[PDB]
C-alpha cells in the first residue's frame, strides 16, 4: 500500500535500499539528513532484533543512575572539578557494553557536553556535544523518545549505515542522553505478521507462500516467493491439469485421436438406428412366415436386447464417472440375458417339440435383476464413499489415464456367460438333424459358438492387462468385440427372413 | 538418580522445599544459614529472565566502576565526596529491577556500602564470596537459605559476585530466586530428573503457579489408570480408557451354552440315526410316493443346517462367519428345493429331479464362490474386517457383521417359498395315499413366516444384541423350522 509512495521519494538511497550497493550512494550529493518518516511502521518495542532491546537496556541503567544522582539530597551542581570526570566515565561506560552502538553523547545546561564514538577499535572521546542531541525535542516535550530510520552524513557524503536515535530525559528536564544504535546489520522480514514494515507486496494468493532468507542485511527484496503446487517460471503460475510437481509446465494426461472417436460413435448410432428400423419393419411384416417359425415378440425382444447392448460403446466415449461404470454392467449383463436366453430358449422349444417362453424367460431376468440390485447396493452403500472407489487413474510408466476398474464380480459373471452358452452348445449338438423349413437352428448355433469364443478372448484380454490400456484402445476393443458378436447375431436371425 | 540422596540430607527445609509453607521453618531455630549444595547443575541456564536481568544490571554497573576507577586522572580523594556517588551507584543498582533484595559494594581504594529494599522504602546504609575472589570475570553461586536471629529465613537467595581493577573490590546482588517456577520433567531445567514417575507407561505434565517447590507435577498414566501416591496401572484386556479397572468383555453364562450345544448335538445324532433307519427301511409302501434319495437329501441338508447354533458358541473369527453363510444358504437350498420340487412332480403328474436340483446348487455355489472371493480378496486386509464391535447400554461385545448380501438372500428365500405357496394352493383337491402335500404345505408356510420374522428381527437391531441372545434366537428358529420340517415328512411314515 506504500510501495508506490516509496518509489517516488528517493534518488540515490532508492537503489541502496533495494540492492545494499554503496557504489551509487557514495556518488550522490547530499544537502541534509536523508531519513524516512512514514515508510516505516508504528514502533519497534515488541518485534525487534535482539540488538535494539540491549541498546535500550544500556540507556535505561545509565538514565536511572543519573536520575538517582540528580534527585539525591543537596544536589551540588559542582560541575567544574571532577563531576565532568564522572560524566565522561559514565559515557565511555555507556558505549563499552553493547557491540552494536556507534556513538553516544550526553548534554546538560543549568554549559558543558561530552560524546564518544567507536572510531577504529578504541573509543574516541571529545569535550563537545557529539552524536544524538534531542535536547530541543525533550525540552519541547517537557521518559523515552525513539526516532525514525536515518542516514548519517560526514564531510558532505551520505553515510553507508542506517542509524536510529534513542533519546531519554534527565531529571524538570535539564539533560539529554542519546545512543545512536547502528541499525545497518539487522534482519528484516516483509512476510512477518508484526515487525518492521511487514509488506510482502510481490506474491499475494495464487500459488503464493513467503519463505525468506535469515541473514542478508537491513535491505529489502530478500523473500523467495514459493509456488504452492504450480510452475516456477521469480513468478508463480497455474498448471495444465490435475498433475502436481510440474517440473515443466507440460501436460501429463495422454492425448485423444478425436477424428477416430467421432467415426466410432457415428457408426454405432447408425447401427442402432438401423436396428430400430428393423424392429419397425418386422412390425410391418407380421403376416409372413416370420410369425409361424419365430414369433414376433421374441424377435422384437432380441432386437431390443441388441439395442440394449450397444450402450457400452457410447458410455466409454464420455469421461469416466461412477454412475457410468454401473450402467455399463447393467446394460451388458441384462442385454446378454434378454438376447441369448431367448436364443437358446427357442432352441429348447424345438428340441422339446422333436420328442410359453416368456414365463420361462422372466425367471432369467428376475435372477439378473436380483444380482444387479445386490451388486449396485454393495457398491453405493459401502464401497463408493467410505474407502473404495471404481474410477481409478493408472500410469503408463510415464503418463496417466482414467478408467473404470474391475473386480472378482466380473470374473464370475463372465464364467456365468460361459456356462449359460455351454448349455446351448450341447443343446445345438443334440438337435443336429431336426426337420426345419428355414434351417434357423444352423444360424442360431453359429451365433452361439461365435459369442462363446469371441467373448472368452475379449474377457481374457480385458482382465489380463487392464493396467496398461489407455482410453483409445479399450474403445476399439469394445467396438470390434460388440460389432462382431452382436451384428452377426442380428444378421443371422434377421437377414434370412427377407430372402 | 540423586532422588534418594536428596531424601536423606534434610530435617525441616526438605518439607519446606516440597510444600513452601513458612509456618514450620519459622519455628526451626538455626545458628547460621543452609543451602542445597547439590543443585543438580550450575547457575548458567535460561529458565527465568530474572537472573538475566540481574546479571545485565550487575555487568552494566561493574563495566562503569572498572572504566571509572581505571580511567586517566583517577586521583580518588575517596573520603571527601566520592561516597555520595557510590551511594547513588548502589541505591540505583536495586532501584531498577523488581526482584533484587540486597545490594552492596566493598572497596579498598576498608570501605563498604549496602542498601536493602526493607518494606517499600529502600534503606541505604554504610565472607565466602570475597574470600573466594581473593583465592581466584563473573562468579555465580548455588541456591541457599539465609537466617539470622530468625529461623532459616523463608526465602531462597542466590549470590552473584564480581571484581574490579588484581582484586580490589566486590559488588554483589542477591537475586531473590523464590518466585521462579521449576520443571522437574524438562529436558534442560533446575532439578530435571524423576522423583517417582516412571515414563514406561506415563507422562509428566507440569503446572504454572505456586513458587520454587519440588514435586510440583501431576503425572499422567497412558494405556492405563492411576490409584483412586499417584502411580500407574496396566489396564484390562483390550479396553484403552479404564475409568475403573473393571472388565469390559461382558459376563457370558456357560451352564446355558453347554445345554444348548448338548441339545443341538443330540438332534444331529438323532438326525444321523434318522438317516440310517431310512437306509434300513429301503422297502415299504410309503417311499413309493417319496423316494429314498429325496429323504436322505433332506436329512443331510438338515444335519448341516444345525451348524449355526454350534458356530456361535465359539469365539467369532473370519473363517466362522463365512461358514455360517455357506451352511445356512446351502442347507436351505438342498432341503426346500427338493421339498418344493416334489410338489412340482405331483402337480405335473396330476395332468429324476436331481438334474433339476443341481441347477439350484450350481447357482448357489456360483454366488457363494463370488461372495467369498470378494470378501477374502479385497475387504479382509485392505481396510475392512468381519469382526465388528457393538455396544448394548455402555458395554461391548464381539460378533459377526451383516451386509446387503444377507438382505437380498432373505428376499430370495421369500420368493422361492412364494413359488412353493402358489404350488401348494394349486394342488388342494388331488387324491393321495398319505396326504403328504398337506404336511409339506404346512412346513412351507411355517418356514416362510418364521424365516421372515427371524431375519427381520436379526437385521433390525443387531448392534444391541449380546452374544447369549443371538444364540437363543438361532436355537428357537432352527428348532421350530427344521424339526417341524423333519417331523412332518418322517413321523407319518411309521404310522
Numbering used by the authors:
A (entry chain A): 71 to 180, 189 to 220, 262 to 290, 299 to 360, 390 to 511, 525 to 668
B (entry chain B): 72 to 180, 189 to 205, 211 to 220, 262 to 290, 299 to 361, 389 to 511, 525 to 668
Please give me the paper's original passages concerning this structure:
GPR158, a class C orphan GPCR, functions in cognition, stress-induced mood control, and synaptic development. Among class C GPCRs, GPR158 is unique as it lacks a Venus flytrap-fold ligand-binding domain and terminates Gαi/o protein signaling through the RGS7-Gβ5 heterodimer. Here, we report the cryo-EM structures of GPR158 alone and in complex with one or two RGS7-Gβ5 heterodimers. GPR158 dimerizes through Per-Arnt-Sim-fold extracellular and transmembrane (TM) domains connected by an epidermal growth factor-like linker.
The extracellular domain dimerizes through the side-by-side packing of α4 and α5′ and α5 and α4′ helices (′ indicates the second protomer) in a parallel manner, with a buried surface area of 1806 Å2. The most notable feature of a TM domain is extensive ionic networks present in three layers. Layer III contains an ionic lock, a hallmark of the inactive state in other GPCRs, by tethering TM3, TM6, and ICL3. Overall, the extensive ionic and polar networks in the three layers stabilize TM3, TM5, TM6, TM7, ICL1, and ICL3 in apo GPR158. As a result, the space inside the GPR158 TM domain is not sufficient for the ligand binding. The GPR158 TM domain exhibits both inactive and active features of class C GPCRs; hence, we cannot elucidate whether apo GPR158 is in an inactive, partially active or fully active state that can directly couple to the Gαβγ heterotrimer.
